[PDB]
């Protein structure tokens, strides 16, 4: 079966995912304890195993890197793709290295405050905010979001709208177009799939491309991390 | 200096105590993170180190054993000796394998309840309770404790006293003898040195002879552990 020392560690509540190659003639085992990723290393003598974190000369926590890359990160990747394939509005330079998605409703105070918080990074060209509009808070949310999407330059209109705290006057059409309704409904479903029904629901990448989430108004630390600082 | 991989781990908040021999050509380092003991193992390639716990074929957590034996346990040993050298009263067989010390006052409800809880183990000859009397709760505590020490068979009198819930009538002398006062004062100082002023203050051995403490009335789990079950 499995080496005795490793079997002993399994009995401590660990479920093995797979085996992997490690340095120094050691064999590695990737697993989980409850929801936590863990790495086990079989010693050269083969009669001992160490459950813990391996570091290299440069000081990188190799176990952390592997756990984030193979356990925590994967499942959310297809979601990041779905957001990229959605009809989002661009706020910032198209080539900004840091991409942040935000599900926002026209009648949401914190969406506006987050928009303001992000200015330094967006204006410097470091971050680009991609907004996926939804109409779920107020009776007029759908129509207002659709009106923004119906404007000549939706992205600019949204920026002006958020900058004005929602005081920006708009031309609200006689009805929501079928295309606008599809965008809003598709965005709402994706938002629901991501797990947070409250706006703003902010998504960004960190920790070996793990899809991260922030809901509501981020505090200073979370903001700096979202912005890739 | 120290191997680079180990130096990297030190930077994560670890302070090294000493180096030690490990299996498979690996070098071990014993240290602490805050108040927690930790073990680090340098890999055969010498360019990596693992911070974690080593297990053997029999399933023993060797790191835990070493940490308990060399870090957590030592400092309290001299205290266990001081209790053994004190004037305690025996409750149970002199050859009972499990020794439990208890600092008790004559006017303490929980001391009496703990005494009752311990009967099964004391009567089976598995545990021996060694009581170090103190007189600190009530005005009459000193005189009553001294009266017990002054009786023909102090140990039996104490047992009868606890069994009766303190209703056992006693012959209280005209004064506390100098020897009785020395016992009470010495016991009180040792109790204070151990860190718990509340009675009952219970001491026992577990985890590689680490001096353990229980204060007040132990719940079922703690009781079973104190009794060595």
């Amino acid at each position: 079966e499995l080496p005795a020392p490793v079997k002993a560690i399994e009995k401590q509540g660990i479920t093995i995912i797979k085996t992997f190659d490690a340095p120094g003639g050691m064999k590695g085992y990737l697993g989980k304890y409850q929801d936590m990723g863990v790495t086990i290393y079989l010693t050269p003598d083969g009669k001992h195993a160490i459950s813990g974190y391996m570091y290299n000369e440069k000081g990188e926590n190799l176990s952390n890197t592997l756990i984030e890359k193979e356990i925590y990160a994967p499942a959310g990747r297809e979601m990041w793709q779905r957001m990229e394939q959605s009809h989002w509005l661009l706020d910032g330079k198209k080539d900004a290295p840091v991409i942040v998605y935000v599900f926002a409703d026209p009648f949401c105070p914190y969406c506006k405050q987050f928009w303001q918080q992000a200015r330094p990074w967006v204006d410097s060209g470091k971050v680009q905010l991609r907004t996926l509009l939804v109409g779920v808070i107020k009776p007029e949310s759908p129509a207002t979001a659709a009106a923004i999407l119906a404007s000549k330059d939706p992205a600019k209109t949204w920026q002006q709208y958020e900058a004005s705290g929602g005081k920006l006057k708009l031309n609200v059409p006689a009805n929501v177009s079928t295309e606008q309704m599809k965008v809003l409904s598709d965005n709402e479903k994706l938002m629901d799939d991501l797990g947070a029904n409250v706006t703003p629901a902010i998504y960004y990448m960190s920790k070996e491309n793990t899809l991260q989430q922030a809901v509501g108004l981020p505090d200073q630390k979370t903001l700096n991390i979202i912005m890739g600082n």
Side-chain angles (χ1 to χ4, degrees), chain A:
Chain A
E1 171 57 331
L2 183 70
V6 183
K7 306 179 75 167
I9 297 174
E10 286 193 317
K11 296 178 182 179
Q12 301 289 48
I14 290 173
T15 298
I16 297 178
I17 292 173
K18 69 185 188 181
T19 58
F20 67 92
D21 302 302
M26 298 188 93
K27 285 186 88 267
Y29 298 79
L30 177 66
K32 295 179 63 176
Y33 169 72
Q34 300 193 331
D35 300 301
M36 173 174 91
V38 303
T39 47
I40 298 167
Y41 301 90
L42 188 66
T43 60
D45 60 77
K47 305 184 186 304
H48 301 78
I50 304 165
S51 177
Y53 306 79
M54 177 177 285
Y55 290 72
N56 64 7
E57 285 177 353
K58 292 186 178 181
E60 174 184 354
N61 183 328
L62 299 181
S63 297
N64 184 206
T65 299
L66 178 62
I67 292 171
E68 300 180 341
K69 179 180 177 296
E70 298 300 298
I71 299 181
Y72 300 150
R77 172 181 164 178
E78 185 266 341
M79 294 294 245
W80 180 252
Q81 291 163 31
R82 283 182 64 194
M83 287 189 286
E84 186 287 319
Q85 305 173 316
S86 298
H87 187 70
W88 40 269
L89 302 180
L90 178 64
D91 182 355
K93 296 238 300 178
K94 300 179 178 299
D95 67 1
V98 181
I99 297 174
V100 175
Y101 290 95
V102 58
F103 288 86
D105 185 288
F107 293 95
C108 182
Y110 288 166
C111 278
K112 301 175 182 63
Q113 303 188 197
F114 169 63
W115 184 92
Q116 194 59 61
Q117 295 184 307
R119 289 313 92 193
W121 291 271
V122 173
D123 294 331
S124 68
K126 294 180 181 178
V127 170
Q128 54 176 294
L129 294 186
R130 297 183 174 181
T131 300
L132 295 167
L133 293 172
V134 295
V136 304
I137 302 180
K138 307 292 186 178
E140 192 61 22
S141 287
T144 298
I148 291 170
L149 290 171
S151 64
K152 217 71 62 181
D153 185 348
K156 184 180 65 176
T157 296
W158 175 244
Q159 285 167 37
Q160 300 176 305
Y161 187 84
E162 292 299 77
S164 72
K167 291 178 287 294
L168 178 70
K169 292 180 177 180
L170 305 162
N171 279 144
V172 186
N175 64 280
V176 179
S177 79
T178 60
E179 171 56 5
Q180 289 148 22
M181 190 57 86
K182 172 174 179 175
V183 168
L184 296 174
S185 298
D186 287 356
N187 288 356
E188 278 141 32
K189 170 63 195 314
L190 176 55
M191 177 174 66
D192 187 17
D193 289 340
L194 284 162
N197 294 158
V198 167
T199 53
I202 306 158
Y203 295 89
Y204 61 101
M205 283 295 186
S206 82
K207 305 296 181 177
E208 306 304 308
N209 290 175
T210 297
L211 177 58
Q212 310 293 6
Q213 175 196 78
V215 183
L217 181 63
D219 64 17
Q220 196 63 204
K221 178 176 183 178
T222 302
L223 175 66
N224 280 280
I225 290 180
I226 292 170
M227 299 293 113
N229 176 51

